[PDB]
A paper describes a structure:
The double-stranded (ds)RNA virus Giardia lamblia virus (GLV or Giardiavirus) exclusively infects G. duodenalis. The GLV capsid comprises 60 copies of CP dimers named subunits A and B (CP-A and CP-B) in the triangulation number (T) = 1 icosahedral asymmetric unit. The overall structure of the GLV CP shows a typical α-helix-rich α+β fold commonly adopted in the Totiviridae and other icosahedral dsRNA viruses.
As confirmed in our observations, the GLV-HP particles tend to aggregate with each other both within giardia parasite cells and in purified samples, whereas the GLV-CAT particles do not exhibit this behavior. This C-terminal interlocking includes three possible hydrogen bonds: Arg671–Asp922, Arg675–Asp928, and Lys774–Asp927 in CP-B to CP-A in GLV-HP. It is also another possibility that a lack of intersubunit interactions, which are mediated by the variable loops within the GLV-HP capsid, might instead allow intersubunit interactions between two virions. The comparative analysis of the two GLV prototypes reveals significant conformational differences in the C-terminal extension and the variable loop, which are critical for CP–CP interactions. It is hypothesized that the loose assembly of the CPs in GLV-HP could expose hydrophobic CP–CP interfaces to facilitate particle–particle interactions.
Residue numbers in the entry:
A (entry chain A), B (entry chain B), E (entry chain B): 197 to 245
C (entry chain A): 71 to 738, 743 to 849
D (entry chain B), F (entry chain B): 295 to 343
G (entry chain B): 393 to 441
Write the structure that this text describes.
Amino acid sequence: LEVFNLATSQFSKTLLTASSKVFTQSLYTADILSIFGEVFLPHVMQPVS
Amino acid sequence: LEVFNLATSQFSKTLLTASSKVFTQSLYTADILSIFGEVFLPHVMQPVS
Amino acid sequence: KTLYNYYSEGPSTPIMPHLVNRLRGLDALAKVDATLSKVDMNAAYIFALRPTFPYSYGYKQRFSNRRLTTSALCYARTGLSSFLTVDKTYTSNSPLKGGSRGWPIFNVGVSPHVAEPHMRTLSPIGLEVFNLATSQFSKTLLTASSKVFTQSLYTADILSIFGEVFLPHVMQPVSNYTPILVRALLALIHILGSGSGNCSLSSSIFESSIPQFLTISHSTNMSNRTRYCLHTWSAYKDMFRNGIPPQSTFPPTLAPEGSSARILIPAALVTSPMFPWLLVLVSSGPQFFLYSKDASINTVDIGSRGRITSPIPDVAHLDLHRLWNLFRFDGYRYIDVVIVGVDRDYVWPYQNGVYVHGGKGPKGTDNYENADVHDGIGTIFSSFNNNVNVQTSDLLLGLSTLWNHITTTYATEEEVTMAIKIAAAFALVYPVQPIVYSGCSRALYNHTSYFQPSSENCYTTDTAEVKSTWDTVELSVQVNNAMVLGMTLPFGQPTVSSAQWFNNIDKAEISMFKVGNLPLQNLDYLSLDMMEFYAPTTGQLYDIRSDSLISSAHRTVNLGIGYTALADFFAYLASVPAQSFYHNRMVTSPISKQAYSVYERFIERFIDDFVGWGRCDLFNLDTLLGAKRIAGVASSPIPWHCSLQRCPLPIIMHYTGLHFGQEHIRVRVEGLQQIVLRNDQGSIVLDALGTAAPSRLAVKLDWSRLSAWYSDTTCAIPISDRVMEIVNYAAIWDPTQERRATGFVYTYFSPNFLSSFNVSEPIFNKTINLTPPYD
Amino acid sequence: RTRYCLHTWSAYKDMFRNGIPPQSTFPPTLAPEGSSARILIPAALVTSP
Amino acid sequence: LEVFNLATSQFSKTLLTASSKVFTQSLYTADILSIFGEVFLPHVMQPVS
Amino acid sequence: RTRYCLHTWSAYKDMFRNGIPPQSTFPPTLAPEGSSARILIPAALVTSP
Amino acid sequence: LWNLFRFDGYRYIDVVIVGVDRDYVWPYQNGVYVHGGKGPKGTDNYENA
């Protein structure tokens, strides 16, 4: 949802709502957000499977 | 229909996501609509035969 | 409305409200009449930049008995699509077949007027910068900035940049992108080539299609170059610490100034292919010259009967200039490129040997301490280097990306429309107008000052088929100079500047008089949009559904031909003679200045009513009145009776609604006059019947009288003998002339040029049948 | 006769800049010989008579 | 009119933005109204001819 | 006679402190010779007769 | 009658051209070099006023 917000809105921040750095090497850091916004943008726009 | 919905969607076009690649890489980039939606974009905007 | 509606209206009462409602409708038609995104790219370019204008011809005869005529279709086109000169390396002084010794330079200056900005909306980062500007610090004011993303545009440093060098725009967020859009449209049109496919003064030499490959040539003596200085943000900000140095670009810009400007470009966007095309289109131009890679495979020669000769005889020593070379734009003379978000080891990705101030230095060092100035866009951007060969698609990729991004993100539809309307004034280049002369009958030999038939500026080069008897021009040096000096833009303005690259010497003579002016692009808007300081105008990714590059260029060329046609119509209504636009327009007759005075009123009224831009930037009399009659070249003995008319009649009819159908030809009670002349020995010498030509007021009150006037004074032009049917039956009787009798003038096009009208598309290689249908 | 070239999809898209072959290929009717037309056929349909 | 609106606007005059330059650099600074609005400031406050 | 000096805008503003030439130049009517008046003309208008 | 009248006006006037390069050339009388324009020797950015 926050990746979608980054895709559809100009950056603020208030948009960083779910990501955290508490857990090391998890799937919830900012790097994973970058991965999602880079190589999975259409699925972010239209989530299907 | 998925490709049409993607191409007619509203983006923020910031450097965080891949929606900016249409500007930073080239007009003809596959990073949002896949190579197929990009190759067939004009034909799915106006489907005729 | 539709094209069917407009073809059945005709001119009406006041003709200025007419011809502008028609133009707006025709422009609206061109927006939707063809989806060019579903065809091949070359086909799209052909269909956009070279429109066809179909029409049906035909003539009647007095006594027809089993006469067989073909009612076919023809497709009229106007304008030069490129220019053919002698090779830069060519030492002989012999005249080449179809190759001009030089070429015109349409030098455009800088408009003092400012493109009016319109309101924008702040981004959240910009909103917080605004809060910092208008409120005492708290904090609670830091609402959008973050340090999660490294080297992004959302840290506190970018806030400092905005509050330092863009404060007025923070206070009043506005932008206008019309001038860069104008330059982009012109770049596309001049690189590809708009018009009819004619590519020479010879009127019979055509280029088959868009070139596939281009060649870049540099010329120090002939280019119009901009100086560039590359800095990182830290190095650029550090040179203003100890006072203000000379030529400071630091202060913000509301009204752009031609000398010196700064652009702040994020590091992510420097590698975009649009970036060099961004540096071009705001700089001076041309900084390099563009040629078709080889002129043999594209150029053809067309016969009088439509015989295509593919390899023109002397193509080995000819250069095929693009229209890009015939134009000269004044932009910014000095640009400070400031890359934002880079370290002290930053490397210029383009041309080697180029070091960014504050970046990687020559040997191996960081924080380069020199701010080197590079003269010309070619000294950086190796893709613009001398003798570079490039596919046109690769060249245009950056332009298309730039246009798409700007028109979907930064600019509004109004800005794009204004850019189209302005660019249409410089979209096309036309050769000097050729005219013929019927002459006078033998019976009137003693009552005329112009007895013999004649012609002017009628040049052809094909030798395969029969040459037209009216095409008597031979291309000497002085005649070539005169013909180049007679070339015009859509609104009629010529040039008095020209260039020549002969032997091994390149030389340009640039007059202080300019054919027009263009506004500068405020680069602060560009910087702030590229740093996401504004909210985007739209969230769409593609302009295919709205205001694409090729659709915009098609609209621009459509409006440019419309400007040419309406200008010809105005010159007719203002009785502006064709000879007032020749190389010797100043030394021939005092009619020229009066005609300019009358014509400029029509032009300015139209420009204010339709374009809305300040007239003087699009048309003025500076180049007309600064004529340059060169050495000799005597004008042919033709009376000044035909108007300006750069377009064929069917195109003028399309844009004006003028109807010249066969129903206006009389075939069958007394409105004629018996005209009598006597000599000293009381002897009647004329005793002839005559009819009065209509006054322009009568035409104003009844536009069908102009149609009748066409059908009473027009004859089909013969090809092999200089005797028309008309001169055996009719003549012009002007009582206020010392000698009352003259013939007819008839702006001339050429059978070779008219053969190209026989196919729906400007493609002629070998399988095209240009022969007249059914003989 | 007509001239034919056979490509795999991977090889065909790898002969264009950044991949991504052109979107439209229909030529002007007056010049069908000017360019090269293309046909995209899935491997399943190739074996069909 | 833009220059007039700028010069009649309300600022906080803190050291973070350029509105403080009228105090830290000189009374006649171009950093807010450009060199042109600064040169023509008295004449746009009272436009007459 | 009158004495004339010709400057470009860049050169003219670079002969004053921190750039920024003076805002007003109209002299007292009793002393028109005391100072130097200036005229700012765009490059487009210079070529006008 | 032009010769019979004598007018008093400005004695020193600065003419500032706005929007020209450092190689600007005075289109009127030859041998006249604009401050910051083309110099006598063919050099740009003429230093003398």
